[PDB]
Structures are given as C-alpha cells and as structure tokens.
Curated annotation (Swiss-Prot):
Residues of the full protein shown: 16 to 224 of 732
Free-text domain note: The TPR repeat-binding motif mediates interaction with TPR repeat-containing proteins like the co-chaperone STUB1.
PTM info: ISGylated. S-nitrosylated; negatively regulates the ATPase activity and the activation of eNOS by HSP90AA1.
Region (Interaction with NR3C1): 1-209
Cell location: Nucleus; Cytoplasm; Melanosome; Cell membrane
The protein's name: Heat shock protein HSP 90-alpha
Taxonomic superkingdom: Eukaryota
Family: Belongs to the heat shock protein 90 family.
Species in which this protein is naturally found: Homo sapiens (Human)
Entry binding sites for ATP: 36, 78, 97, 123
Self-association state and partner proteins as the record states: Homodimer. Identified in NR3C1/GCR steroid receptor-chaperone complexes formed at least by NR3C1, HSP90AA1 and a variety of proteins containing TPR repeats such as FKBP4, FKBP5, PPID, PPP5C or STIP1. Forms a complex containing HSP90AA1, TSC1 and TSC2; TSC1 is required to recruit TCS2 to the complex. The closed form interacts (via the middle domain and TPR repeat-binding motif) with co-chaperone TSC1 (via C-terminus). Interacts with TOM34. Interacts with TERT; the interaction, together with PTGES3, is required for correct assembly and stabilization of the TERT holoenzyme complex.
UniProt modified residues of type N6-acetyllysine: 43, 69
Amino acid sequence: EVETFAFQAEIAQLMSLIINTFYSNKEIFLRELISNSSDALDKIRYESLTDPSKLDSGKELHINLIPNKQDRTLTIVDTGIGMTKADLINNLGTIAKSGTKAFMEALQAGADISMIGQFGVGFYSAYLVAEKVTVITKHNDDEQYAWESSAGGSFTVRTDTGEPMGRGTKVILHLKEDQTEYLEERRIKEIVKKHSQFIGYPITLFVEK
Ligand SMILES: NC(=S)Nc1ccc(F)c(Cl)c1
C-alpha cells in the first residue's frame, strides 16, 4: 500500500533548480549526505547517554558507502537515529520549507549551489547525480519505512517489507547515466578524503567483487 504525496511548493522548486541548472561540481552531494548521516549518529549517541536501551536496536555507530556498478546505484548506510513516518511526510518538509526559501534568495545574491548545507537542505543535492532516490529508514519508535521520489513534484511512502535494518537510514541513489564516476573506488575515496576527512564516525567503502 503506497501513499503518494506532493512536495511543498518551495521544495519542488528547489529540486527542479538542482536538476536543471548547469553545475559541474556535483561531488558535493556526498559531503552533504555523509554530513546528514553524521548528524543522525550524533542524535542517537546523545540520547543513549541518558537511556542506554536506545542502542538495543544496534550498538555500532558507523557509515557505509556501497557502490553497485551493475544496478548503477550508490548506497549510503548509517546506523543513526532514523526517521519516523511523521518525519518522512510532515516534519522534515516543514523544516525544509524555510531553508529552501532562504537558499533560493541567496542563490540570487551571488551564492552558489555548494553552500546548500548552510541552509539545512543538503539532502536534495542528491538530485545532482541521481534520477531517483530511495530512503529506507528505521526509528526506534516506529516501523521500517520506504520513501522514494524521482522529483516531478511528488514522493511516495510505504511500509518496507524488505530486509530489516534494526535502526538507521539507507539512502539509495539511482544515478544518472553520465554520473557513473561516483561508482569508482578511487573517485569516492578522493571525495571522502577531501570533504569528510574529519567526520567523527568510521566510514567504510565497500569494494565490489
Ligand atoms: N534534509 C532534509 S529536508 N531531508 C529529508 C526531507 C524529507 C525526506 F523525506 C527525507 Cl528522506 C529527507
């Protein structure tokens, strides 16, 4: 049972700008997604200080990057706090409503796309390299959910029937045909070292077989 929702007007406007604007420095998408994973890990880590049972769904706090050349997908897995259904449908879109508006004003005052993280809406930079984004997420207080969008102004949410993750968020980037360089091992390593060297959680790059 799949529910279809319309993006908020400002968010849909940002996604169209991110997809249609000529901008060559696309690698920053990884910095933003990794930074988002780091925030989610900070959150579950801080909650576990006063409530250790919040880690019963998984003690390890890490970030995995999983390129897949046959499916042309790049997956970023974190064991962070995860997202509830209300987050996927309401709360995150409400918070991003104002950050998108501010980011758009700045883009006309001289700012460029690489500053998107300063407005809390870095997640949508995924559409620099992806034609479709799938998010599998599990929060301690909710069921496992699957969020998906190919832009166009709508997204879908459904309960995920696949493999249980215990706790965290899986971001699956279905890459555009011309962005397969982000599936190469030495390219991902160069980007992580350049932009995410100081992330305070272990980042593991799965090599393919
Ligand atoms: N940084 C932001 S606004 N992230 C975000 C918003 C809505 C979503 F459904 C997902 Cl998966 C992520």
